[model samples]
Target: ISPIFQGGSYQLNNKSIDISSLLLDKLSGESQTVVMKFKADKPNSLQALFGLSNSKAGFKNNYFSIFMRDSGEIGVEIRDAQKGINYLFSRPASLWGKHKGQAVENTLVFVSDSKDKTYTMYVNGIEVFSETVDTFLPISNINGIDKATLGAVNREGKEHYLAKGSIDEISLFNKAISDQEVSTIPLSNPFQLIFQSGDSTQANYFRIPTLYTLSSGRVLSSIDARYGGTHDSKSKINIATSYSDDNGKTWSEPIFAMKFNDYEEQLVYWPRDNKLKNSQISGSASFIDSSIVEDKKSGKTILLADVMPAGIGNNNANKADSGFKEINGHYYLKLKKNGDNDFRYTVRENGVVYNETTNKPTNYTINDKYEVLEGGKSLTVEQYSVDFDSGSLRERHNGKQVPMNVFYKDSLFKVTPTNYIAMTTSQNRGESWEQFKLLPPFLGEKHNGTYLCPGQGLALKSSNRLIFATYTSGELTYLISDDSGQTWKKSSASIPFKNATAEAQMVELRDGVIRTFFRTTTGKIAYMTSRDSGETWSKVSYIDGIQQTSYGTQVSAIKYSQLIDGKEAVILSTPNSRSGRKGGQLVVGLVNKEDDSIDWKYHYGIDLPSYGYAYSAITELPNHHIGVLFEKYDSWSRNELHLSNVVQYIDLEINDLT
Candidate 1:
């Protein structure tokens, strides 16, 4: 007799039989087995048996099959055809300890047949154990026992743990099968391939990197380097750039455009002096704000932004007497030579001497060593001392001295108390870059307290205007350099972003109208437009359906080509919430002519983990293939603080939208 049956959607004789009517027998033999075959469209959970009973009057001799639960535990049960019983048996295992209760694809088998009145079970091709039972009941006779039911059993208002996955094969024999026979049974669908599923340690749900095309045929992407520990850990941010030589099919590996390292020393309390002093120990550094632009005249790509310095405040612990001088709190730009394989940096110290013996610059190094400034000389030292008085240098022993000629004097290079925009230029198509120079402070000393973090900037082709976007203490400011990089001026008007740290980006549309997109502090994507060059901006309006968070968001765009169906498109990236680890998504849209609002066409998840991506950048490659880069971890904690530097490439055909 063919006792085995197939379930859900399986056909028989131009018709189908529902397998829910078949009841497992506990007494016919100590072990009972059933197998069937089926197909599935997506990943699903599965169950093997249903209906269980305990040792009682009408069911005194009732004992069902014992098998592995979804939580990787041993569970015992009883099955009856007419009057079903409910009972569950479970025991924990060490092998499946990590992924307990989670269903995984593979082998599932239950065996219940023995002359000694005992029952046993197996899962994923592994035998749990062999057990004997005193209570044994016979199988129930029922009609229509071949079609598998989707949600098969219901007892006392509770549904059985029905199998939610596709079944491919079921086998039954009068005797328990050998280990080799158990291994030969196929558990997954042979006709289809299963993509990787389940949670991943490396990927965050909301911080997936994003890819986009720029109007200049360049592809830009951003990745996060989560710096702190755990969920509330701080985030380290970096942006990578790649170009497509083709329309958008191929792309180059990303180039390190910008990064922030805010290394700071910790503060300690000196009980005797009744003052706070730095223990000379380092705490976590937070570096995030960043923006990039390619110079039209030089063709050099530059990054400008800000970062927190070593010590903060003017208390005794922060006094210059500690041998460590506090740098004026402000955002400064770090520059590198275009195409320089080895990146070297030069910083202006207050009164310390330069050390020429070692090419290392003072302050700090990645190796945690200090370069001391001596009297008109520089030296490397294991340690040194400081005088709190005049904020001037006192002594340097064995430290290396750097040359004095490398220092320059100019307002552009002078230190300012306020945050200033730093810029870099490349003369050879992003291959080489010159050191960064501070663009004239956004509003000068008059607005010194007005902090401005550089937002997205772009080089226009026609006038070759170098346009940089900056959010002042309260408004969105556009700085334009008409005569190249020599001087800069703010726009005639600035857009007010109420209580919002707006991260903005600018893209020149095919019609020459510059459209600017901004992410508000309240988790919304909004846009404004400029018709008169960098002179003025329109009122901001929200883009519906796109979720955002307070950590900030970014917008980018590329001129349309074959991959985008020749339709100019813009891309935006942001987090899903403010304080959680749920990652975010990337949105693409076409500019509406009647209004600058986006005609959102396509949207897809960045698919990284939540809170992993705090910030991102998007640019177009020549090949038309989109490249997305984003921060890889939560910016608040310092746990598995993997840098958000992942690059993802997606192939999209614009015609698919139609």
Candidate 2:
């Protein structure tokens, strides 16, 4: 539908713009009413939907503001320089829609009764909040409060909460209108679509929104550009990125941060990886589930992603984990060989097929690029890339086209653990990136191929070690690096993912301890603490009180404030839904130094509940503000998948959270 297109301004970061003074000309002595239609693009912040400040500095000097919170609460706050935030006219129950926290066009009407100092608020003609003040204040007593603004107030003391949305059709009344009469006025819709499927030059589906604020304060954003629809593992997915110089007000064009291509210019684009767009041939490479981090020591930006085989996904992943033979009380990558009651056989070195009785390495060695090294020289299945038409990618060495299916009938390409981990970094805050590297499957002496999960990562403050989360055999562990990106120490069995399916985001505590909050299948957030600064972790436990869908969605958490009343607080963002990943929420939990427990006190619903909300990332911005980039819909399995304009950005405050 076409909209009237409001001639208004927009806000990018934790900043604001002053409007031409409303100069209301005066006010009604007995009663007054003000009505406006507005909507927030990223509705999770302490933004003034519409309000006035005497000095335009903030809601401080004898002003009234109808502000919003990321946790899905909206209220009118009256402040005076003398009293300082006096007469807070808000309640948790009296908020705008609390369940669906994302932005939506709605009609809001405020009626102030001067006679009894009564206040009432309305949404779309329905009364939602009402209260009375003991100390009577009037519109005239606002104390030189002339200007009306869309966002940005209080650049001085409190954090600046700017609204990033649209507004129009405002009407100021000298007298409060009758409820029946005001209810007839329709609410206007002037919503604008930002990121949509096929709407931009991006991929068919954009999933997993991650944001990283560089040492220079410029913002870097990353997304999973998925082809072959929104499905994972089987699709060609590239890690694409963009940047915002003016705190998200404007951003650069899309750039491929990390992806796959052919081994050369004119050949098959590597069958093992699956990123589809711009491939030379059918076989392409893919990188998914992105996590970004910065090195405070070097001020360099690094991105971590999961590189998967062309058609292999963790979902349909072979669970060699089940019914496995134990060696030295440890696990190994197992194979059933067939659907037979008894399964046997496995690998020794670089995913080489073996003849157990012969005790010899078969004539097979899967190359680092997931190709056959020994089955080459001509138009053979092993040399299928150039001879794809000549052979069916079916190997002739053991009469097998797919690796690992070395000795079997009617075998699929389900052999020789094909997944690996990849990395890319930018020294110049995402303007350009290079140094792409892929880590082969962890074929240690133990030989249990492990894979890493994606989310925000952090470098430990205690040592020069860099640790990120990954999973192996339904358990969780860390991928560590001490010498930066050159080499890594990938291992399994060090830690168990007590909580299932973890995609962890790490944060450092004030006491130099490291804490990791994870996504789990229990519909609860699981957390683990490391007193030795991520070197050793305590048992995984579910953070009490907060509930979420059991599908294990990724989350973003950061230490927003340092010490408050001898406690530190962390701001966590995730889709707080019961049915699925749709109810987007941001919460502040007070951490007790003694027990390291988070007081799960306040939660703000940041997106529309049940509409669509999923993978999200957090970036702390200038001032006490934070930036959140997330998918507006469930891109994983939603029909809205690949639908236009789901990726979004929002700015939030630390103080407003508590």
Candidate 3:
């Protein structure tokens, strides 16, 4: 027998159980406390757990109850018909919903203090809110609360706002309980790995975990599925994604959102010896280091990735050529023939190959699938697509499925052997994506090599601008879009510092004030602010308390909308070790309203100090919980990629730290 159905629990689905007689004589005066343990499956809408009403028909006259708002907020409602008293005690943040599944449980308490004229709430014994109101009244003092029930509120003899889950226990006390006594209750904090090495996938390693929460409370996570071990580039890598509709209690299978078909994915291991490490895996074009952001105006999600040509890595990319050519004031993706000495061909309108010297269309053309065609006929080669379950590439011989690449020698159509930016968009929560299109190296033809920060982008609340933190030649910059990524331009802001600056994440402090926390060569996490939405940035300011290694690693930062202890909170996840990327920490900072500076307040480590940690990402999950996705090994040392490297996901709340 399962514990839920047999352990004095009542499963509810738009149904009510009468408890008026059980608590009839026990219920009493102005000062009281009600404690209940329950499990709610879907926390998406309005719900009522326990309450008292004047009649079974409704509670319009006299009632006292606990309820949940459509936005997932918990509240208490009190009504007195004759006395004309109607009051509500609720907070902005939802404290529960941390765990999922049929066996998961939650404990909550409501205390009415007539002496202090206040109502306090506690979730799993942690005090969530305490507010004082002058018009507050107890259930005994409220007139005609005769009907008491569990699971729902009755409206016109019908169960309304039903609680959809199992209710285990309920207790009523005539007097107020102490906070110390409430804190003695039990709560569980658990963690697990959403993506592990060699778990039903051919990829031997994973890195760069990025997370985002959509408007519908869906959480999206993306990572670099490195098939050629954990090496960054000069290896086979593709962008993979997984989404959760139930607050990450469950996740859909991984999807290859962006991939390379020219080279097949083969398992490889990073060698231990430093002499042979550099030659671990090579000769594969890849899409690596992706960032996710949703455009609120259009309800579409945009994913941007770093496009690397075969045999090219970050250390050796051509800065002069942006993999494009300017012809007659319009830029087109230019290519070089396999035997040609100089690049003289351009991909013109309708994917036609044009000879720029004579301005005449060539026989070769690129199709929507990025495959090369001659006189409207397909090439003799075929393309590869990854099998969802086997995680192995499978060949497709369809006429339009021929493999096409920009730098691979085997492909007939070849573009410049340089780095570029590729983008994809999905309107329905990443179910399907549009064709991958190359973004014109935002720095234009002069300085083309640019890299996006690994975490996520920011959609400004004050305007329609979309901002993504990027770096150009060790200098921090921005990729800005005015019409929801339709057109993009680089910022004219001065370089904040002359030193090397790498991957950074952004968090908006207020409506228009944005703070970008970045990784520096000094091994510290530094930040800059842009008040006018990325037009210009402030000077570099190093944040203390976060551990820094000799070589800095990427960090994720996000602004939590709810207030904590009367102050705004900003959460950051990173490797918190100065020796190397071996310890992970989730730090909380309270934003100072005076200067927009952050005060490092709380710190919680997700793993032990001996464990490896690198490249972490964070997002605010539904019900105010912090969701983290991070690398589980010292990717900097490259010794742990021995055919097994993992990425872990964990959810935490503010009370879990303080």
Point out where model 1 deviates above 4 Å. 1-287, 311-376, 379-420, 428-432, 446-456, 492-497, 510-512, 521-523, 545-552, 558-588, 592-598, 601-616, 631-649, 656-658
What's each prediction's TM-score?
0.49, 0.57, 0.68
Tens-digit lDDT string for candidate 2 (38-122): 6654565467765566654543566667776653445776666654436565422112332133455667788777776778777
In terms of lDDT, which candidate is stronger, 1 or 2? 2
Which of candidates 2 and 3 is the stronger one according to TM-score?
Answer: 3
Winner on lDDT between 1 and 3 is 3
492-586: candidate 1 lDDT, tens digit per residue: 34555564666577777644478777767656677777876767777777777766655555544444544243455676555555554335456
| Candidate 3 clash pair list | none
Q: What's the lDDT for residue 486 in model 2?
A: 56
Please list the Cα RMSD from the true structure of every candidate, rounded to 1 decimal place: 15.2, 17.7, 19.9
Residue-pair clashes, model 2: 26
Give lDDT tens digits, candidate 3, residues 374-468. 89887744433322233332323233443565545467667777777888888898787787888875666656658878879899887888888
RMSD of 3: 19.9
Q: How many clashes (backbone N, Cα, C below 3 Å) per candidate? A: 124, 26, 0
* Model 3 lDDT, full chain set: 0.73
Global lDDT scores for all candidate models: 0.41, 0.58, 0.73
Candidate 3 off by > 4 Å: 1-190, 197-201, 267-278, 380-401, 492-501, 643-645
lDDT (0-100) at residue 30 of candidate 1?
Answer: 33
